[PDB]
Design a protein around this ligand. Structure first.
Ligand SMILES: Nc1nc2c(ncn2[C@@H]2O[C@H](COP(=O)(O)OP(=O)(O)O)[C@@H](O)[C@H]2O)c(=O)[nH]1
Ligand SMILES: [Mg+2]
Length: 178
């Protein structure tokens, strides 16, 4: 199999760890891990090729001991995430995550991922965002942001329902093979 390294980044609580666990284990977790600390390697076949895809989760800003610069070397593809219930997490894509990823991984393909797609139609989410004069992120906003940052693709998924989860990793694997 071809060896590729995937790193997942994005705002705290936008669903990165759960996306890795639901893809790797096919089960939404019941306990809390900030950062997957076991070794996840996925076997993925795309367009006839066997790929071993190492899944690197990341730490937020306060976990200095596992700071992201330690994890960026030799990355083959980036999953850059925001949550559909958080327009703030989307605004951090161009302001925070793209400058950081381009600093450490300037030539690596990016898949822009909108997580928690199940909350787009959730009334708690709708009413909480509406009290801020906000609304859940629309697909066209994700697509526009993909163009802005030069992402290889824009994908939406829900770790909670599994909708779109395998497809995110198949797209990331096809980008890593280029
Ligand atoms: N509704 C919903 N909640 C999710 C989803 N994925 C994760 N969460 C929840 O969002 C919170 C943060 O998830 P986590 O994966 O730890 O986020 P991280 O900080 O980006 O790693 C937790 O309470 C999860 O249970 C999803 O697809 N849908
Ligand atoms: Mg996490």
């Amino acid at each position: 199999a071809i060896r590729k390294k995937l790193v997942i980044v994005g705002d705290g609580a936008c669903g990165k760890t759960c996306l890795l666990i639901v893809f790797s284990k096919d089960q939404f977790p019941e306990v809390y891990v900030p950062t997957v600390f076991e070794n996840y390697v996925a076997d993925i076949e795309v367009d006839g090729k066997q790929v071993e895809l190492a899944l690197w989760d990341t730490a937020g800003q306060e976990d200095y001991d596992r700071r992201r610069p330690l994890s960026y070397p030799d990355t083959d593809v980036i999953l850059m995430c925001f949550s559909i219930d958080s327009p703030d997490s989307l605004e951090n894509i161009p302001e925070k995550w793209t400058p950081e990823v381009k600093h450490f991984c300037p030539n690596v393909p990016i898949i822009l991922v909108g997580n928690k797609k199940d909350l787009r139609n959730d009334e708690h989410t709708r009413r909480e965002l509406a009290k801020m004069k906000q609304e859940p992120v629309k697909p066209e906003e994700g697509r526009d942001m993909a163009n802005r940052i030069g992402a290889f693709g824009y994908m939406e998924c829900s770790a909670k329902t599994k909708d779109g989860v395998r497809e995110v990793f198949e797209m990331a694997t096809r980008a890593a093979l280029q």
